[PDB]
Amino acid sequence: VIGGDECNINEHRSLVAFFNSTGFFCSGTLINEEWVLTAAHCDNTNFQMKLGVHSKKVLNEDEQTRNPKEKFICPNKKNDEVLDKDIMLIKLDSRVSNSEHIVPLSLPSSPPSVGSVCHIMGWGSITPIKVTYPDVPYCAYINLLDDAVCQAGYPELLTEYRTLCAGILEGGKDTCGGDSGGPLICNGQFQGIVSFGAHPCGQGLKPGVYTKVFDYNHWIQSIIAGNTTVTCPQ
Ligand SMILES: [Ca+2]
Ligand SMILES: [Ca+2]
């Protein structure tokens, strides 16, 4: 995250870190005691998830590590198109208990309105050009923008993709390398997943592109209920 500041230890309770032997590579959002939502492009081999993490160097005495027991992507997702249905649901191998560091964030009841203030967070780069990974997650507030802004900035962005456009029109505050899969929280509601953006980070007229969580509510709910053959909206 660029143009932000360190998150308070109490500010990111639903934030999950994805890691392998090299280190953190993605984020996710805890949506239930045993389910995590992230971007499909965060899929990897030989990885685990850390919950209740603040500092990478100084452990919280009660931070939790979990394995991906089951992974679900849209059955009607097109491979070779990274922006098509960039969403993945993961079942944890065991439940996590609630604490001041770990609490689930619920699925949204309605889509967000243009102009709403949204919260972004992650352990991604805090400098726009050089890669500078922070020890603690960084947090920033941005605006939900009209889809036309992202259309004007990204020639490859199809209107068919179910996305949200968020940032600062003129630039300056943005997600950055390593923030993939994290939450976009607008007016306290979980609305987006960090999916796509530009480098250098925070350029004017090149806002962040986020997976629109609301559209996938029925698919997510169906899988949690037990219907593993559930389809995503076209
Ligand atoms: Ca504590
Ligand atoms: Ca519904």
What does this structure look like?
It is classed as hydrolase. The entry lists the keywords serine enzymes, fibrinogen binding, glycosylation, hydrolase. It forms a monomeric assembly. Crystal structure of saxthrombin. The protein: Thrombin-like enzyme defibrase. A 7-stranded antiparallel β-sheet has the order 6-5-2-3-4-8-7, covered by helices on one side. It is mainly beta and about 230 residues long. It is globular, with a radius of gyration of 16 Å. The protein folds into 2 domains: about 1-10 and about 105-215, Trypsin-like serine proteases (Thrombin, subunit H, Beta Barrel); about 15-105 and about 215-225, Trypsin-like serine proteases (Thrombin, subunit H). Helices cover about 5% and strands about 30% of the residues. A hairpin with a 2-residue loop joins strand 3 and strand 4 (about 35-40). The structure holds calcium ion (2 copies). One calcium ion binds near residues 60 and 101. One calcium ion binds next to loops.
Number of domains: 2
Number of strands: 14
Provide the spatial order of strands within the biggest beta sheet: 6-5-2-3-4-8-7
CATH architecture assignment name of the largest domain: Beta Barrel
Apparent shape: globular
Q: How many individual helices?
A: 2
Beta-strand residue percentage? 25-35%
CATH homolog superfamily of the largest domain: Trypsin-like serine proteases
Helix content: under 10%
The helix/strand order is EEEEEEEEEEHEEEEH
PDB class: hydrolase
Keywords: Beta-barrel, serine enzymes, fibrinogen binding, glycosylation, hydrolase
Assembly: monomeric
Entry title: Crystal structure of saxthrombin
